[PDB]
Subunit: 327 residues, 4 copies
Amino acid sequence: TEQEDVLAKELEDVNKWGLHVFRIAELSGNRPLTVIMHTIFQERDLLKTFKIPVDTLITYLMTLEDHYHADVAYHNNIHAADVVQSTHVLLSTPALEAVFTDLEILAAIFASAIHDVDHPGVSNQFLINTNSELALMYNDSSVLENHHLAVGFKLLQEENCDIFQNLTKKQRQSLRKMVIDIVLATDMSKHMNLLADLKTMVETKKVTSSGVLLLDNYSDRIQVLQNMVHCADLSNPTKPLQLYRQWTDRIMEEFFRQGDRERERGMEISPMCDKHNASVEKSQVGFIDYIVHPLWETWADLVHPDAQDILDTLEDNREWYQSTIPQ
Amino acid sequence: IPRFGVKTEQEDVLAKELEDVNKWGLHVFRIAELSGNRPLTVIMHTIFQERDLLKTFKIPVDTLITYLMTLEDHYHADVAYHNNIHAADVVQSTHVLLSTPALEAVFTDLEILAAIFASAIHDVDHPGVSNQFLINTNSELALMYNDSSVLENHHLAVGFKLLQEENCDIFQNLTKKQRQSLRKMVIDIVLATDMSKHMNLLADLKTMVETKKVTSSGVLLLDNYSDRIQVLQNMVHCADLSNPTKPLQLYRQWTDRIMEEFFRQGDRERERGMEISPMCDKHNASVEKSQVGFIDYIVHPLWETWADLVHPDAQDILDTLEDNREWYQSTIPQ
Amino acid sequence: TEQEDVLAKELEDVNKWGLHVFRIAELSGNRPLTVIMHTIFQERDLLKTFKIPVDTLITYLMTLEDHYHADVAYHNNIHAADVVQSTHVLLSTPALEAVFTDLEILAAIFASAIHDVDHPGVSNQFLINTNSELALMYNDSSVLENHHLAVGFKLLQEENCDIFQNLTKKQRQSLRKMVIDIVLATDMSKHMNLLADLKTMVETKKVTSSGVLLLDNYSDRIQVLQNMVHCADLSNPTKPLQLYRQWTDRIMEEFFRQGDRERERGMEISPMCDKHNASVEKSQVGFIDYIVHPLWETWADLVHPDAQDILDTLEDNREWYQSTIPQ
Amino acid sequence: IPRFGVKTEQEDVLAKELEDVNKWGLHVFRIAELSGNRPLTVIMHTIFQERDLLKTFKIPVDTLITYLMTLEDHYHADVAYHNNIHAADVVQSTHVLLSTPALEAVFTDLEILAAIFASAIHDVDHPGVSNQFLINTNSELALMYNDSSVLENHHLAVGFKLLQEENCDIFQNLTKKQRQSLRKMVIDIVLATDMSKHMNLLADLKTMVETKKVTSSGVLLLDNYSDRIQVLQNMVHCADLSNPTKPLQLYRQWTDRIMEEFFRQGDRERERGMEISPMCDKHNASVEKSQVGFIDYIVHPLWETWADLVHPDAQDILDTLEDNREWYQSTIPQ
Ligand SMILES: [O-][n+]1cccc(C[C@H](c2ccc(OC(F)F)c(OC3CC3)c2)c2ncc(C(O)(C(F)(F)F)C(F)(F)F)s2)c1
Ligand SMILES: [O-][n+]1cccc(C[C@H](c2ccc(OC(F)F)c(OC3CC3)c2)c2ncc(C(O)(C(F)(F)F)C(F)(F)F)s2)c1
Ligand SMILES: [O-][n+]1cccc(C[C@H](c2ccc(OC(F)F)c(OC3CC3)c2)c2ncc(C(O)(C(F)(F)F)C(F)(F)F)s2)c1
Ligand SMILES: [O-][n+]1cccc(C[C@H](c2ccc(OC(F)F)c(OC3CC3)c2)c2ncc(C(O)(C(F)(F)F)C(F)(F)F)s2)c1
Ligand SMILES: [Mg+2]
Ligand SMILES: [Mg+2]
Ligand SMILES: [Mg+2]
Ligand SMILES: [Mg+2]
Ligand SMILES: [Zn+2]
Ligand SMILES: [Zn+2]
Ligand SMILES: [Zn+2]
Ligand SMILES: [Zn+2]
């Protein structure tokens, strides 16, 4: 338990943006998703609130984690633990204090933990082009996203894995719809139109008598939740450079692997996947310029301005990569 | 099925019925009976031969026939409305719509193949119950498709999967380019049959009619994929919603069937202590009032707009719809 | 009311070989499996014993019944209800009194209930020959049987359908193995081996202090349960002629329908499936002589003299059909 | 297009290594490195070319290579033993056994293709855990296969399913009769790889040896499908269990890998609070003693019997097995 102290201390940062997730992954014996999720649940007192037997929770978490591919560079259990922990911080954003119910909170966190489960390390288009069984089952539409959801729920059926066994029928139905709405929203093909609404919304932004954001209908409450987890999934560039660079190393490794596979198959190599003609630095700045920043700028507003330290970090990291661009 | 190389008595009657394949109002139920319950197979085959689709896409005839029978075999005979007769009707209706003057020479053979194939598979393996029923019972289908367009996704998955059975790949001779294109259009069209897409689908159709463009010929102008697929989606959607525009004799048979299917679902919901879906309670129904509402809020608005787009091609269809609307209206007991 | 009293009265014969199962099918609005299963569960006190909530039982039964095809002439919910009821009678045979446990009883009945669920009305060979998805999934081996089991168990996951939610893990563990063993044995491909082994047991027939049969190991126990359900699945010829004749009209219609489909596809028409070259009477006599009678004669030996009247009804029916053979 | 189905600049070193493809003891680990982790693709391609299977069954070369890369891609790189290297090894081992003098000209080209294909797909998509683990956790796989030869059934289903991916149908030019016969043999062979069937397989192999028949040539006489398929099943079974009969240098690497996989399952079982499977507890292991036992109760009885069937073809293989058995014996801590 010598390191049990290190892990324990490391976890003390679970509420902080910039947790040493990679260290935790090492300290936990490659169980970042299980320990982090377990801490967040204990912390938010979700086990007692939803009467979740401790053994059941841990068995499901290990099972869920086990279904993330250890051989995949980016989309693995570490990325999952990261999006969970990040959504967890984004939920505690002052501008949302006491806004969401324990169920909505449970939904956001659960959705984050399962959002990429059983990811093969290749894109939807690659699965589509090859006529993979997954693309055939989902009609080439949000192939992976649909799959992530199905697996996430199916695993609840394994031995002692149903963590929602004590929710009421109504709670289960409401939880399930939200989890689905959120995960399906992680598909980058939804990003554009998804962003517009986050804007159109921040325009009419309303506050309560408590100074916290005001959300009425399901429509508005889910959009915030959708964009929120969507931000957590696209939060690598807003973290301290040290962590961010590791994520970039990982995503590039996954990209290049796909490119090697497309190349050996005589398939057109996907954008940014050709290791023989790459622009890692230039791609990061462009990624930040046309996608991440535009998204994270709006959320910075929405939770005005508890996201400041986060937005400045994004801009700082951009400059860094910018100064790394060859020629 | 023949003898000595000549059609049998039945076959000849059937062939004579099939002569109206290019006409709105085909005696589809008569064809279903005459063909030994193979309306989808015979109608699809007639249309493929009519449009020379076998040669154009090099589809071996035995493969086409084997796939068709296999596809038809996966529609449920015990389902009153959503069966092979409904599929054959939608195929034939789409076929007629494709040949409307306002669209002559607008679509490629591939887009034509896509609209017809999508129509043929659009409701395959339909269980006779709504998406919400599948969602409420936590069915495996709903679990697989995340409660989103459960049936429509299933219809597509099954339509394509059946291509893998013995000698069923009718697209074996298409290039990967053709197949990727064909597949995307078919998927776009069938997913658009989910009623949850009706409103937006109609909105865009209206918008298009607003900015409508033609050429030296009174033929519509469609540039991008977005407008071409929009028209194809609304075309098959209209076909799927064409029952009220057919001669009253046919329209009523369809109403009897959808009502039977609705009531059957209602009885299942009642057995299960579930809330009975709208119009599915045989004990508290208003068949006539419901057909009137169906026309006033859904069918007429859709077809009216379509008639604008292909004006004046759909005039008669529109007038028939209005005649049938009045008929049902006058049937409402007070 | 009336039709309700008629149904209630008909169900009174639930413990008798020769129940008017078709009449019950009509009277219940096509719910023979639901009403007969429910009746039998009450009769054996299974709801109390395994604490099965009544709403859960009814919902599961209707769900299971709904997954049998109404358009299938023979392999539909009436056949299922019939096998369930037939197994229920065989279980009460004197020579087996107090031999099986409540769990083993439950397994045999549940197995009977789900043994042909979602049957498409065509043989394994037809499915194999057309390269169907089911055959590909099950490697052409007991395709339908494996499928009936997978569906039967899967349906327990639908809303309020888990009738074993109160069984212990050990009970679930044992019940599942027994159900699997029983249904896989319904494949006619395993008939010959089943009969042989059954006979062997008839030779090593070990009685008990109470004069009832003696079964030590799981192997002998499951063997008797497998043959029992097998006999039930093959009991049509041993039932009152009015019933038997209906069964024959149904199986023949299913056979002929497959034969037409095979004819359509240019496939070789399966044995007895060609309506243009049929011999219904002749075929039934052959079915009794080479399969049904051999099996039952043996079962009669094991439970002597418990099934004398069943055996006599068979031999009687055999003659009826024989004399029906035109010349 | 590449010489070995895979691009490589070390092509020279790789080509040299592949010269021993017909030899027991090929340096498969070296080939995996030289091929860029494509041992299965490279070895299968080499064997197919060598046995002239591409021409004999009109298998397009790009199709073969795409299928192989696809098949190989579905073996898990994170699994220490049951991965693409094990697959490549069993394929190559079966290839050698098929060429043994006592079996010359006995099997048809189709049976040869079946044995080799079966060897290639026999452990595809293996999760690194046993059937029992999948059963006790109520996995979807066990549910689908009713807890019977769960993995073996899945390996077959995936191996065949993958033929449906883009340009992956290597059997597209086989007549219907050939496909049916090939499919049956492959299924019979892979299902026989389940250890639960080992004892019965051995017993039948022994019986065959006891009534062994040879033709006018010096080769084994196999009259019926039953005897033919039995020999092929045991052949692939021996290949799957051939690690202890390979040069010690290779055998120890295989041992390190299976032990790594065993212990990982052990840690997972421990985590979940499950009883730890035999030899899976890294805290109470006896690696050396376990290998001797494995050889004494399973591997040697099997190979001793196979050696009798093909006497004296496998004499050196048996000699190696025995030498290796002694090495581990002396490695046992006293
Ligand atoms: O598939 N997927 C879904 C959600 C999130 C991610 C993260 C994934 C991702 C994550 C971290 C990251 O770098 C860093 F943050 F670690 C990335 O760098 C690259 C060059 C865009 C990319 C992508 N987001 C958008 C991607 C696109 O390829 C493009 F770059 F925008 F073009 C896509 F949008 F898909 F077209 S890929 C990947
Ligand atoms: O499931 N589905 C998809 C596409 C088309 C159809 C035809 C289906 C249909 C077809 C023929 C028909 O009557 C006649 F034309 F046969 C119908 O009568 C009823 C009362 C609407 C309904 C429906 N269209 C819209 C339906 C709705 O339930 C409602 F009535 F409009 F509310 C829905 F829109 F779904 F809410 S159901 C059914
Ligand atoms: O699929 N299946 C599994 C178990 C039991 C049944 C009942 C099924 C059955 C049931 C009732 C019946 O008649 C009557 F009892 F209703 C039957 O008539 C025929 C000609 C044998 C057949 C069969 N049992 C054995 C059948 C065989 O075709 C043969 F006759 F033995 F050759 C088979 F064994 F399959 F080869 S088919 C059907
Ligand atoms: O799952 N599976 C199927 C076929 C072949 C293998 C190879 C697998 C195998 C392969 C190489 C090997 O060692 C070496 F050759 F690499 C092994 O070491 C161990 C302790 C038996 C085991 C097994 N064969 C039999 C195994 C058993 O656990 C037991 F040892 F016999 F008890 C089993 F039979 F399963 F009970 S596991 C594994
Ligand atoms: Mg994702
Ligand atoms: Mg539909
Ligand atoms: Mg059966
Ligand atoms: Mg194996
Ligand atoms: Zn993600
Ligand atoms: Zn429809
Ligand atoms: Zn049966
Ligand atoms: Zn193996």
